[PDB]
């Protein structure tokens, strides 16, 4: 390889690497920082660093999971779409979840309401306030 496939710029292969390794990276980080949000942010940063250096990941005895762990270790020690998406990460919990479910997952207002434990009216209000906030800080 999945790694070898990502090194071919198959973007979805790198998505699959995230699927396979994200929880392990998160768990390594979780117990070493103050707060879930920080642990989530450094998990994202760990993968982003691996991705940006993936063209160098070619040394003899390399191991991708071990590399991720060593990168996260370094980060904890040192502790357009990209702009669109990092804007999303800045929304408060409710607004972030609303935009993620509605637009990143493609759930309807009704489906989103069921997941969030809110009424569809509250979802229509929430998605409006969420996109308006993206419009300001972006």
């Amino acid at each position: 390889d999945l790694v070898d496939r990502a090194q071919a710029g198959e973007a979805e292969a790198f998505g699959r690497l995230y699927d396979q390794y994200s929880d392990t990276v998160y768990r390594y980080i979780y117990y070493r920082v103050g707060g879930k949000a920080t642990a989530e942010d450094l998990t994202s940063e760990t993968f982003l660093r691996a991705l940006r250096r993936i063209s160098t990941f070619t040394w003899q005895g390399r191991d991708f999971g071990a590399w991720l762990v060593t990168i996260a270790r370094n980060l904890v020690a040192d502790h357009s779409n990209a702009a669109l998406l990092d804007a999303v990460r800045r929304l408060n919990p409710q607004q972030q979840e609303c935009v993620t479910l509605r637009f990143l997952q493609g759930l309807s207002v009704a489906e989103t309401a069921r997941v969030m434990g809110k009424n569809e009216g509250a979802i229509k209000t929430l998605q409006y306030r969420a996109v308006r906030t993206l419009a300001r800080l972006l």
Binding site: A6, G9, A11, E12, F14, G15, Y18, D19, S22, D23, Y26, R27, Y30, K36, E40, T43, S44, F47, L48, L51, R52, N81, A82, L85, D86, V88, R89, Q96, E97, T100, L101, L104, Q105
Partner: protein
């Protein structure tokens, strides 16, 4: 002599764990592994994964 045998059982256990006297050891490792672990928020995973796939497409565009 008995030093190389301790090495062999260790290697057998390692190989067994990947797959999963020695059956008790595996049961203990499974017992520890079966406990609930902290999990990345599902909705956070959605956004992070999308950020990474996009960063890749940006690298290759």
């Amino acid at each position: 002599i008995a030093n190389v045998s301790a090495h062999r059982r260790a290697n057998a256990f390692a190989q067994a764990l990947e797959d999963r006297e020695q059956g008790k050891l595996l049961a203990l490792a499974s017992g520890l592994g079966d406990l609930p672990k902290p999990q990345l928020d599902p909705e956070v995973k959605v956004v992070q994964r999308a950020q990474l796939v996009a960063a890749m497409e940006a690298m290759l565009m």
